[PDB]
Amino acid sequence: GTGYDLSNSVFSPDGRNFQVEYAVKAVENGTTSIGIKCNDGVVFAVEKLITSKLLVPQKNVKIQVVDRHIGCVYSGLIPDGRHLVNRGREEAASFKKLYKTPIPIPAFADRLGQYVQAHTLYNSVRPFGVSTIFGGVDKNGAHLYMLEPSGSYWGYKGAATGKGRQSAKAELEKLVDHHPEGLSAREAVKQAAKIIYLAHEDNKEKDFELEISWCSLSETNGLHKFVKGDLLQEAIDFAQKEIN
């Protein structure tokens, strides 16, 4: 038969949930965004298309914090991302209120995962139109995670999603070769700027603005902070040099 892609929680005869796969299309049309895991933290970076010189620079921030130790970035329908993040904040508060310890990164992944999976269960809601990269430092390491509209998520060495995902993945697979003994928080910031710049060539149409954040046991004491100011410029430079 036909018809299997108009409601949400519906199995197609070849076992798929087309509405989730259609949600991925919104993700793929989004901006490219990545995550790199290093020896004691994670870095997050994202491409901010300068639609028009009318946008205030530096001022439409995209990376969001959860609690004090978790960073989240996403590609796709931005307002869905904020929603998921809001839920994440509540979920991180509940956990801390009862257990006192701030929510461990894998435990947070499953909180998000379970919620997003929930929106593939009923035809009275649509799936999340965002893939989300997030992570942080907890009582025993750094953890990077990526989460699809299906609710699928896994832990990564590095991750990418958006229009430039393929350049990013390719450039990240490279990163696991040179620098395999480990990648330090600082080098990972630089490499992040490189990859965003390289991935931007599939969006060369518009000019863009780089935004990086990190969460390093050694460089941020384990708290999630934005790479701004001088260190930011150094990584922007390292991108220009290594692209020419």
What are 153's two structure tokens?
Answer: 């998520």
User: Whole-angstrom Cα distance, residue 18 to residue 35?
Assistant: 27
CA distance to 113, 119, 187, 197, 224, per residue, from 137 (Å): 19, 28, 18, 26, 9
Q: Which is nearer to other proteins, 169 or 225 (CB)?
A: 169
Applying CB under 8 A, which part among 38-46, 100-108, 187-195, 219-227 lies near other proteins?
A: 100-108
- The site for other proteins, by CB under 8 A, has a size of 79
Look at the chain and count its residues.
244
What are 137's two structure tokens?
Answer: 């430092």
Strand, helix or coil at 206? coil
Q: Which of 29, 94, 166, 233 binds other proteins (CB under 8 A)?
A: 29
How many other CB atoms are found less than 10 A from the CB of residue 54?
6
Applying CB under 8 A, which part among 170-178, 184-192, 204-212, 224-232 lies near other proteins?
A: 170-178
Chain residues 184-223 in contact with other proteins, contact rule CB under 8 A: none
Chain residues 116-145 in contact with other proteins, contact rule CB under 8 A: 116-127, 129, 144
Is 31 considered catalytic here? yes
Q: Which is nearer to other proteins, 2 or 244 (CB)?
A: 2
Q: Examine residue 50 and tell whether it contacts other proteins (CB under 8 A).
A: no
Residues annotated as catalytic (active site), given as ranges: 31
